[PDB]
Amino acid sequence: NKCVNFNFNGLTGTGVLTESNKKFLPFQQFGRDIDDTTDAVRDPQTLEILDITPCSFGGVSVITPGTNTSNQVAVLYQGVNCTEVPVANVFQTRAGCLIGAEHVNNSYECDIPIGAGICASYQT
Amino acid sequence: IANQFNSAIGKIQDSLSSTASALGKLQDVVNQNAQALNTLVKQLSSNFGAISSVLNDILARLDKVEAEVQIDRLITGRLQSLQTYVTQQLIRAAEI
Amino acid sequence: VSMTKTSVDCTMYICGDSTECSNLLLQYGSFCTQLNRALTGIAVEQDKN
C-alpha cells in the first residue's frame, strides 16, 4: 500500500503492492495480463499473491487567464487522485485533480476546458 | 403514416437488440484503438537485437561503456515503436 | 464522431525508472515532446469533433 521499487526473484519493477484475490497454480511465480506485462506476483517466502498497481503518474497542466490580465494559476494533475499530490483550494474531478481553482455549484458556459464536464474561468 | 412510422421505429429497436454486427462502424474504432495500444505495449518485450528486453537486466550484467550501447538499441527500437503508434493515431484521427 | 484520447509519458514508455536510460534518451532531443504534441493534438480534437 505504498509505492516501492520491488525485486522478487529478479523480476524488478516499481508500483504499489497490495493483497490479491487471484489464486495461482502451485508452480506459477508471476502473473501477467493480455499485454504480457507483470501485474501480479507470488512472494517466494510467505507464499501469497500480490497485485501490482503501477504507482500513480500523469501530466501536470496549468490553467491560466492571460498573462496581462492576471498571474494567478490553477494546476491539474491529469488522471491523478489527489490523495497522492501533496507528496510533491483542492477539487477532485474525473479528469484528474485541480488545485488553486475554487469549485462552484453554478454552471457557467465553458471558458477553459478541463475534462469530464468540468471547465474553469476567472471570476469574483 | 403514424402507424407506419411507429412500426418502423419498432423494427429499429428490435434490430439493434437482436443482431450482433449493426454497431460495426463504432466497434471497429474501439477495436483498432485497443489493438494499437496492445501492440505498442507488446513492443516493450522485443529485444531489438540487444542482449535483453529488460532494462534492469542489461544494467545488471554489462559495465557502463557497453551497457549504454544495449540501452541505446532499446531506446532506438522503443522510440521507433512510439513513432509508429503516433503515425497510426494521426492517420486514424484524420479518418475520424 | 471521436476516438479514445490517449497520452504517453515517453520517458515511462522507453525508460521506466532507469535514470541511465532517461539521461541517454535526452541525447535524442525533442523527439519525445514532438510525440506528446502530436498525441495532445489528437486528444483536444476529440472534443472539437
Binding site: - | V41 | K5, V8
Partner: peptide
C-alpha cells in the same frame, strides 16, 4: 459497444460526459 496502464500509457476522459451528449 463492448469496450492508467504500466508503461506510461493513459486514457483521458472526453470534455463532454455521456450525460451531456445525451442532453444535447
Amino acid at each position: 459497444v463492448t469496450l492508467q496502464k504500466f508503461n506510461g500509457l493513459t486514457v483521458l476522459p472526453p470534455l463532454l460526459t455521456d450525460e451531456m451528449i445525451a442532453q444535447y
